[PDB]
Every structure is written in C-alpha cells, then in structure tokens.
Point group: none
Chain length 127, copies 2
C-alpha cells in the first residue's frame, strides 16, 4: 500500500464560517486534480478530511469541517473521481498540525494567525 | 505501507523576483514547515523547484535547481539530516495551471495567471510503523 497525502488551506477554499467552495477553491482543486490525473491506476481510493482550528464551538466546528470535506469531495467527483472511490469526513478541531506550538499565544488575532495551519483539508490518495 | 506527504510552498513568497536566495519570509515559512516535519515519525525528503514557462528553459532549469538547493540547505540547518534530503530542479516542466493561462494578455496578466506554477514542492517519504 502506498498513499500520497496532500493539504489545502481552508482559508483559501472557503470564506469565514462558510462551506461553499470559492472560485479560488475550485481553482486549487483543479490544480490538484491535474496532478492526480497524471496516473491511471487499476483501482484506488481517496479520503478527504476537513479540519478547523480549536477556536469556537466544537459542535459547530465538527459540522463545518464535515460540510467543507463534502464540498471538496463533491467537486472532485465533478472533475472525474468516481463517487464510490472517495469519501468525506469532518474531523473538527482534532489532530492539529500546530500541535502545542500556539498554546501560549494570547491576543486573539495573533492566535488566529498562529492556528492558520490547522484550518485545512487533507486529501489521502491510494493507488 | 509507504506514504508520501506532499507540501507546496509559493516561490513568490520564498524568493524575490529572479533570485534563489531565501527571503526572511521564506525562512519563516520553512520554520513553520520544519515544526510539522519534526512531528512526522521517521524517512527521506525531496525538494522540487518549479518555475513558470516565461524565459529560457535552460535558465529556468538552473534557477529551479538553485531555489530547491536553498530550501534544502535551510532545512538541514533546522535539523533534517543531510543524508536524508535532496534537491531537484524541474524548471518549467509539470505545470499545475493546465491550459488556463494559454491565451492570457497582457504580460503582467500572464505573470499573475502563472503564479501557481511558481512553487517549491516538498515530498516526505516514510514507512508506517507496525508490529
């Protein structure tokens, strides 16, 4: 089994608290799909995971992350990924890539900036 | 299970126009990357440099090599062992913009349209730990 893992910035794909792909988001997914289409495997699978930062309501962040992941999957299916070979999952605030690095960044705007790497969609491709 | 994790960095942030020396903002972006890399449990790293299709292909190939090497040199300085990372210039090959920019004018507009092509890709390859 060999995966390839990719990451896209949620701040690019979506507006603040929204889950509709922006034009910039579609373009980012077009560019990724261009890369993914360079291989023609017999079979494979794609897993799309949405993540938020640790700020705000966890129930709201879970819901938002799931809708974001779904919007990405729906678009990628539109581009050509077969619907039964791709799945979406919202992971909410879990598994931050910033780990404990932003733990003591106090001022709200500075913390939001420090947490930016956590606001992301991860795409795992198996072939 | 062998897994490759891919990271993409905008060349326009890392480097000034036509230069291969990291800007301070490039070092800061690589510091952020290194933090995340240092949490991936070991492994090897390839750094790919890409340009847009403007100008000499020989020149673009050389510029892409120097940019990739600059990134590698700095990542080693952060703690990536020297024997586990390498640089590769890709010049103008393998663009991500498709045909999207094919008929774009004027020139300033074209440089903007091709921006996603100007990038450094970092591939971290490793084995899933098990027993």
């Amino acid at each position: 089994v060999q995966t390839k893992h990719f990451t896209l910035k949620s701040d690019v794909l979506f507006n603040f608290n929204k889950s509709t792909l922006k034009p910039e988001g579609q373009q980012a997914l077009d560019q990724l799909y261009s890369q993914l289409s360079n291989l023609d495997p017999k079979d494979g699978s794609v897993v799309v995971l949405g993540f938020t930062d640790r700020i705000g309501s966890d129930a709201y962040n879970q819901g938002l992350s799931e809708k974001r992941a779904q919007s990405v999957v729906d678009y990628l299916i539109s581009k050509g990924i077969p619907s039964d070979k791709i799945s979406a999952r919202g992971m909410g605030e879990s598994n931050p890539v910033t780990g404990n690095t932003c733990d003591n960044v106090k001022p709200r705007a500075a913390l939001i900036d420090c947490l930016a790497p956590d606001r992301r969609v991860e795409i795992e491709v198996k072939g």
